[PDB]
Structures are given as structure tokens and as C-alpha cells.
């Protein structure tokens, strides 16, 4: 009904309310409240919308098979929202560059460098873009590291048993074979699957299947080139040879500059007397 002191100390309190029994521990509205309505009401709402936000992130991460690139896609979407806010609230990109010609101008265009006193003057930029309302929320109890997981897919389990029958305990390849999970959680999956089942794992180590469909999935879902050991070894040897030639050329140029400096010092000693 509303906030009103019905009764207490005699029976189930019913003067103006919707209660008809004692032991109101379950939802714990009983009598009436007159403290912290909206700031405590809009806290579980914010928590619930952030949990639905993380769930739809976990749903979107299934499509793009790159976790951290999905996070950068998320921040790319929110900076698309930021440039939409730049369209909304407000040229506008008044910033600097790697050189001193910053603005408008690089200098004066009449006779000479006129605006060099103004071009030589970072912290004046565009920032009134991202405006968001406030709260008085919290993240305590335990904050920092953690693991956001889910009840695992049985088709992922079938793919895992087929993988372990095809390409076994290869932690980095197993983490890359599921390129939207992570590393420590699939290690907990390794010890969990090592726990409960001897039969299919023993038949899997009996099988010894050759790894071709695994490389097929790793070259399609990642779009990685996978150049062989001869091509990659030749590229690494060519990079090492180019670095050694650059170091030798730098040493020879430093020796030539030191010889030129010694000749210039001898010429200055000859011109001093």
C-alpha cells in the first residue's frame, strides 16, 4: 500500500498495508520507509543494466572471434557515440601536431612569420563532449581480478573432446582454438575435464589423429598466414642480417664522423696559430 506504521508487538501488523503474516524476512518490506528513496532505488537498476550489458557483450563476443579486438570494437562504438555527441552539443578539432606549425595558419601569410608568437603558445582543446549523470554507487567486498564465466556449451565440449582426440594437451593452441575464451579459465576446464572422465580421454589418447582441420579452423577464424619454418626462418635471418648491416653502417658512420671531427680539430689547431 504505502509507508505507514500499522502495528507491532501484538500480531502481524496490519493497519494500512498488504501484509497478513509474520516472518517478513524474504523481501523485507514490512512497515514503512521514509529514508533514501530514489538514490537507493536507482542502484540495483544500474547494477542490473550493467549485468545485462556484460551479458550482451558476452553474446557479441561469440560472433567476432577476437576478445580484445571485440573490446576495442566496443570502445570504437562508444567513441562513435562520442562523435555523435560532438555533432549534438557543438571546425571542432582544435588541437596540435608533432611539429610547431599548429592552429588557421602556420605563420603569417602577409610578408613573414607574424603569428609565430601565437603558434608558439595543448591544454586548450575540445573536451565538452561526454556528459553523463552521477551516482553514489560502490564496488566493494572484493574488486580487481576475477573470472566472468558461464555454463559451458555442450557443443564446445564435443569440439573439445574431438580436439583432444586430434591435438592434445597444447594449452596455447587450445586457447587459440577457442578465440573468445581466455587462458586461465580453460586451464580450469583442463583440470575439470581431467577429473570426471577416463574412458573417452583414454580413447582420445589412443586415436592419434593428424592436425589438418585444426589448422583449417585456425587459418580461417583468425585469418593468419602461417608461413612455414623455411620462409619464417629466412625472414628472421634477413631481418637479423639487415639489423647487423645497419649496426655496422652506423659504426662506420660514427668512425667517419670521429675522423672528420679529429681533422676539424687539427684544422682549428692549425688556424689558431
Amino acid at each position: 500500500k504505502k509507508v505507514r506504521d500499522g502495528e507491532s508487538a501484538k500480531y502481524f501488523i496490519d493497519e494500512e498495508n498488504f501484509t497478513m503474516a509474520e516472518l517478513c524476512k524474504p523481501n523485507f518490506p514490512i512497515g514503512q520507509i521514509s529514508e533514501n528513496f530514489e538514490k537507493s532505488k536507482m542502484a540495483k537498476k544500474a547494477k542490473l543494466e550493467k549485468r545485462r550489458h556484460l551479458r550482451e557483450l558476452r553474446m557479441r563476443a561469440r560472433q567476432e572471434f577476437k576478445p580484445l579486438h571485440s573490446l576495442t570494437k566496443e570502445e570504437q562504438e562508444e567513441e562513435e557515440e562520442k562523435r555523435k555527441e560532438e555533432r549534438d552539443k557543438l571546425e571542432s578539432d582544435r588541437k596540435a601536431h608533432t611539429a610547431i606549425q599548429l592552429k588557421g595558419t602556420m605563420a603569417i601569410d602577409e610578408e613573414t612569420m607574424v603569428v609565430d608568437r601565437h603558434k608558439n603558445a595543448e591544454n586548450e582543446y575540445k573536451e565538452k563532449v561526454d556528459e553523463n549523470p552521477f551516482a553514489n554507487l560502490y564496488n566493494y567486498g572484493s574488486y580487481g581480478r576475477g573470472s566472468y564465466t558461464d555454463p559451458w556449451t555442450v557443443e564446445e565440449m564435443i569440439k573439445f573432446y574431438k580436439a583432444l582426440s586430434m591435438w592434445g594437451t597444447d594449452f596455447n593452441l587450445i586457447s587459440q582454438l577457442y578465440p573468445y575464451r581466455s587462458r586461465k579459465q580453460v586451464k580450469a576446464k583442463f583440470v575439470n575435464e581431467e577429473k570426471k572422465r577416463p574412458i573417452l580421454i583414454e580413447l582420445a589418447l589412443r586415436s592419434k589423429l593428424p592436425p589438418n582441420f585444426d589448422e583449417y579452423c585456425c587459418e580461417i577464424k583468425k585469418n593468419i598466414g602461417t608461413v612455414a619454418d623455411f620462409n619464417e626462418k629466412l625472414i628472421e635471418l634477413q631481418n637479423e642480417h639487415k639489423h647487423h648491416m645497419k649496426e655496422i653502417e652506423e659504426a662506420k658512420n660514427t668512425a667517419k664522423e670521429e675522423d672528420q671531427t679529429a681533422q676539424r680539430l687539427n684544422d682549428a689547431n692549425l688556424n689558431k696559430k
Binding site: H97, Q101, M106, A107, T112, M113, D116
Partner: peptide, 9 residues
């Protein structure tokens, strides 16, 4: 302004 030589006063 495309990262080239700067003038001298």
C-alpha cells in the same frame, strides 16, 4: 604544416 622545414626569423 606537413612536418617539413621551418622558417627562420
Amino acid at each position: 604544416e606537413l612536418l617539413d622545414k621551418n622558417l627562420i626569423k
